[PDB]
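Lab notebook, bench 4. We co-purified these components, and the gel suggests they stay together. Before we commit to crystallization screens, I want a quick structural picture of the whole thing.
Request: model the full complex, all chains together.
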Amino acid sequence: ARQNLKSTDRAVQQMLDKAKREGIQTVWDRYEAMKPQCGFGETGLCCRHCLQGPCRINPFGDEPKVGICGATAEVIVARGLDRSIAAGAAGHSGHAKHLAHTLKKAVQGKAASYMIKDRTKLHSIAKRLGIPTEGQKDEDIALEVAKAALADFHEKDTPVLWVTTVLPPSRVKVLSAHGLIPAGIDHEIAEIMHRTSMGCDADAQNLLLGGLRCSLADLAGCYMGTDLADILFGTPAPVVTESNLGVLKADAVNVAVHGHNPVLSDIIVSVSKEMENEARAAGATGINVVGICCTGNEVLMRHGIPACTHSVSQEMAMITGALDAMILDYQCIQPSVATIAECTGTTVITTMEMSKITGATHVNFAEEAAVENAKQILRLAIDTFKRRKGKPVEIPNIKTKVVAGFSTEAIINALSKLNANDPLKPLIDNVVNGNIRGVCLFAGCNNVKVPQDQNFTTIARKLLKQNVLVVATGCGAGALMRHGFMDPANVDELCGDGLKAVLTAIGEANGLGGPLPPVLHMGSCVDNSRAVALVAALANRLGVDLDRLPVVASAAEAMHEKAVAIGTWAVTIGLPTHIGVLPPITGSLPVTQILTSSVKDITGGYFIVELDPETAADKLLAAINERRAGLGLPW
Amino acid sequence: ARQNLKSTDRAVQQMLDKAKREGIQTVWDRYEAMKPQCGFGETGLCCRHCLQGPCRINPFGDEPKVGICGATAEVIVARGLDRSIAAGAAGHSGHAKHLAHTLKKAVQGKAASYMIKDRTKLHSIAKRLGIPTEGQKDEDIALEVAKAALADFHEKDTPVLWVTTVLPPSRVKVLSAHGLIPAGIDHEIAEIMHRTSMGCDADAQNLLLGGLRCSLADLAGCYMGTDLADILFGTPAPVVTESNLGVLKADAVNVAVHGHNPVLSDIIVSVSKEMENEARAAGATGINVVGICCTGNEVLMRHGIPACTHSVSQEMAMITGALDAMILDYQCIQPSVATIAECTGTTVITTMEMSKITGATHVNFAEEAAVENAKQILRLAIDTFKRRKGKPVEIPNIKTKVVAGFSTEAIINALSKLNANDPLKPLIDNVVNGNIRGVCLFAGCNNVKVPQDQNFTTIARKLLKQNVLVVATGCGAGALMRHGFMDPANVDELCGDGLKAVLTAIGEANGLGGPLPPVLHMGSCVDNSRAVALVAALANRLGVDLDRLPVVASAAEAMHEKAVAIGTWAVTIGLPTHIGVLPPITGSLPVTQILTSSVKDITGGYFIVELDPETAADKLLAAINERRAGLGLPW
Ligand code: SF4
Ligand code: SF4
Ligand code: FES
Ligand code: FES
Ligand SMILES: [Fe+3]
Ligand SMILES: [Fe+3]
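Here is the predicted assembly.
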């Protein structure tokens, strides 16, 4: 088996060979077993929204041509897409809401393991929301912020403030004119589920406008999540760490935090440090916390916790034989981990009531008892380490250096070393003079249909050589970090001369041995909201709307409904947005044309669907350069 | 073509012949074109919750056996079902919320077309909710009720009051012990969409418990909808009217109200009466408003507006050639109506922003301008009548007499004529002495897979002969009314001697020429909440929980996600609940076993899946009789 056809990560390839000889089924094996996949589903031409279904429509040929109730291909495709957007928005609803309740508990004295760690961020959020701070106690300010967060989930006398206060007024005006500003986060989710149910909305344009509005409810959840996590756990600043499977250590208790919410992982990290002696009593060197997926990104960004792996290759951490525990909250966890754990010895532990996996151990994690619950969880990990005494493990000796922690505040601060009172100006100067061609955000998942990381690295290499400033989040950041794109030592190899000059000038002004890394890691998937903050700040500084900026996004290997939601809000706020996997929309040309073309006339953004990464890079460059030309700039 | 294989309604058969010779495609033709339907979808063994899909699992045989992410058949089936429940709950969220906003506007002076029509109901709801009334203005009481309604959509310091205040404390306690009381209506909908997204909840029991909780959010929406509609439009009392296509009149402007919300249809009815002279100026006798689906049920129950048709046969009203307008809000409207309108001349008019149909005319309907918007809509209808001057129409001369309007208040009042201060006692006495074997609620849709009305009438006939008191809502009530089950003249033919004696004694005490009708029409689908009120009142009077009462439900020909949600809350509140179509759960035996068996140990209710109606009737009788035996009663 040619493992490089499955993943371009050599550590993953090594574990795939191990899984094969041990007879352990992987995500790639389950994919092979699924081929050929259903063409109706692949194109979006299937509906199960009532008990008269399933209905399907032949992409081409003869009957069936229409759903039983009369639903056309346009309607069916648009309804399916809208439900995916709502599902993504719901995941970010759950995440943000979790943090809002935690902040509220903390400042009410009900969860002493949590506290206001970033007072400056708290006050800045309060001011943005219009909440008074002068003469007010921090705990009361925080209580008001938490109440405002929770209020954005339902209808009230104002729209969703985590949309209207985070985008420039001109953008809010454009969106309002089209009826696209959400009334409430969970309100929009419910309205999508209603309008897409049988015998309701049956006009493609109307349905898709609803989807754009629900995508902004998702944006609000993301931005709220980042805001609240920064208050509770600290705003990221530049950090140095490592990534890939080689960060596991045979002589340590290896504990992966996996899922999404720092409410959980942040405490695991702090408590693990207090349990060092207890781990040593058990014959370990200590507890080695490592990250998977977004919650890994959260603790990487804030604490420099090394990232083990991401997304599609998550099972491979277990295959090493050295993963003593995998601590889960929710989202993007392959439920296969629960059965693979039987083979590998790993203790898989769920912690949230709405996210259990048959065969896992469930240990409820209450914010009110976070430290004690964390100790219980970590003691299971220690017991597991003891059980593998004398057992061979195979940790690929493969890892990269990673510089990360580029929050928007961190980026502005780094730039301020070149211009203290106008920090964005040096960036803009270099866009204008051509040293920086534009900005591309890589975001989102890996997808088993695409050799792992192949689209991210192929596109990033082409853009970097063309002097594009590249930023990344989520498992896109994960892909790029595992392939060396966050190691400043690789700037000479990867970057165009203009971009190199800029990364070097900024790094040198920040007292570094040299440049910023080739790609700036802006955090987890909710932290795509940080990229919004940066872009909106640039828009405001320039006095133009986001759809005039040379900024694009690429979900190069997208998988989750959350990726569909984020991609859709990227388009809604005005960005050309690449998706590198086939979305289930191709069964309807009219829907495809709306999403890739006519939406430009509504929001200024648009999707670029392109499965070939070299071609995608060309299309992204063309989009950046069109923006440059629109600003009167050379390109 | 043997049209009786499609529908057992002779008026529908006649219109099917007309559609055939005119080449107009119908729902039955679109169904035929869809055969054979996908077996993966039919069994629930398909997942499209991420862009790695579509995934499927062979019901039997070889691979694929598991989803790409590791999702088992149990997980996939349970996640799909949970999303259907959430979608149903969302439709009732939208409906109830619409009414809450309307009530609020009315009493704030912003929508003068609306008012408090049922003051007694307003005060009784206030008291149930714990809202003070003494010394308070009606408008302020109503404002508090509307605010309480809107508050139940989100988390707050109390659970959903439209669950906890409408079920007996012992039932609330059972549900609370299992964590099943909703925190907020839209909150639960969003949590379902989150937990069922990729890489989240992956334990069938955990998922299904979540579904039961979300079904109670649906119950709350239903009960809220009925409560608010009764306040605004009046609580139904016994009425006499007619049903089936023969209620259309060639010499009148025929206007169908179709969809769900009385906010719209109630005004159409009142305004149509004011426009009689304008219709006569146009050469009509007047405006003949007729009902389709639930909004038809709403105006039938309150005003005796005749019901034209229901559910699967809705297109047939248009095929007569005499339907001048079809006025739509949302839900259960086949979008085919928009294209069929081109052939038939009918003006199809949408009115709600989130429910448009390509090719229809959209006329926005604002509560703030209800009368003017209604006149605009009706003037389109009048213009349409004028266009068919001299054109032959074919209205089947087929209709039945219908006695309806049996709200729970109406039922209690009718019983009170036998016992003024203990109205429920005569009903209970007759259950105990065997004159009434038990109670069966028929609810829900028709479904093109089942010859229209065949399950409803077959099951009802068997139960009535066995002295079961039958009540009905929605298009189940529609089926039964179109086949004569709401005409008291048919009591001798249909009813067992015991039931006849009871219906006669109650009717005679209410001053009738004779009995109540064979089946009691309790209203629209949200008015399934009326049946809950009745059953809960019986439970409270007897001092036992609902799962000890000889009461069952049958969604004999279910279709919509709303039917799945209602069926699931029927089970959750403790009822044996029949479904007469194949739900997409058979691909997982463990899920099937939970829903049809082990859930008894949680809530006392359970599903009875049975496609053969004679067998379903036997199973329903067995369930009733088991309840009788549990109470120590003969059977
Ligand atoms: S909603 Fe329409 S297209 Fe979808 S399953 Fe039902 S009948 Fe088929
Ligand atoms: S969630 Fe799992 S089972 Fe569903 S489509 Fe994605 S990979 Fe397949
Ligand atoms: S027919 Fe395959 S996804 Fe429905
Ligand atoms: S394979 Fe047919 S419903 Fe998906
Ligand atoms: Fe993530
Ligand atoms: Fe209905």
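The pocket of iron/sulfur cluster (ligand 2) is lined by residues B 47-50, 52-53, 55, 67-69, 71, 198 (CB under 6 Å). Worth comparing against the SEC data before the next meeting. Chain B touches chain A through 99 residues (CB under 8 Å).
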